[PDB]
């Protein structure tokens, strides 16, 4: 499968999440995603084909994971934006007030601005600390997807937010949205990964 940020993948033929970013670990190909999407060794599938398995994850506390893929997958330095693509150029962290967009299988590509950092989400499973908050909307299924600036600087992977009864926070004003992501930097260093860029 061609690995692009934002596309859907399933875990153990049940749950769906979105791909965050293509990365490598030495000769190993992989993608970073949300830790709540799967447990170690859960199987990931893209378009019904097995592409790899969860190699590690942390959740709750943090919300991160990386899936190691088979040699046959094609890693691409890109994030989906409708039918088009945003090129990944690096991982400079943007500051509060910067504009940012996110990509995922449920709401597509949505943009907004970062409104706060070091936010704690109190999930049913336990707290997740140190998240960054943006006001781009998102829905159930967007988890693990890419958060990126239009300039191509990868920010992190979708964790959660205040989804309403319709499954997203797109029907409430930006001023009232809390959409959270896990910072990419600590995930790259924790697992020794390098981002694929173009």
């Amino acid at each position: 499968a061609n690995i692009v940020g934002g596309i859907e993948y399933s875990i153990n033929n049940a749950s769906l999440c979105s791909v965050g970013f293509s990365v490598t670990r030495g000769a190993t190909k992989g993608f970073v995603t949300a830790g709540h999407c799967g447990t170690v060794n859960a199987t990931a599938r893209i378009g019904g084909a097995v592409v790899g398995t969860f190699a590690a994850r942390v959740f709750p506390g943090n919300d991160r994971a990386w899936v190691s893929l088979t040699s046959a997958q094609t890693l691409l330095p890109r994030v989906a934006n409708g039918s088009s693509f945003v090129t990944v150029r690096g991982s400079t962290e943007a500051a509060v007030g910067a504009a940012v967009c996110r990509s995922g299988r449920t709401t597509g590509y949505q943009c907004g601005t970062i409104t706060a950092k070091n936010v704690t989400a109190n999930y049913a499973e336990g707290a997740v600390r140190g998240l960054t908050q943006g006001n781009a909307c998102m829905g159930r299924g967007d988890s693990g997807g890419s958060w990126i600036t239009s300039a191509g600087q990868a920010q992190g992977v979708a964790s959660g937010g205040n989804v309403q009864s319709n499954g997203n926070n797109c029907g409430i004003p930006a001023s009232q949205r809390s959409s959270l992501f896990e910072r990419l930097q600590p995930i790259l260093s924790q697992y020794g990964l390098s981002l694929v860029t173009g």
């Binding site: 998102m138 988890s143 989804v163």
Partner: peptide, 4 residues
């Protein structure tokens, strides 16, 4: 907030 909820995970996703």
């Amino acid at each position: 907030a909820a995970p996703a």
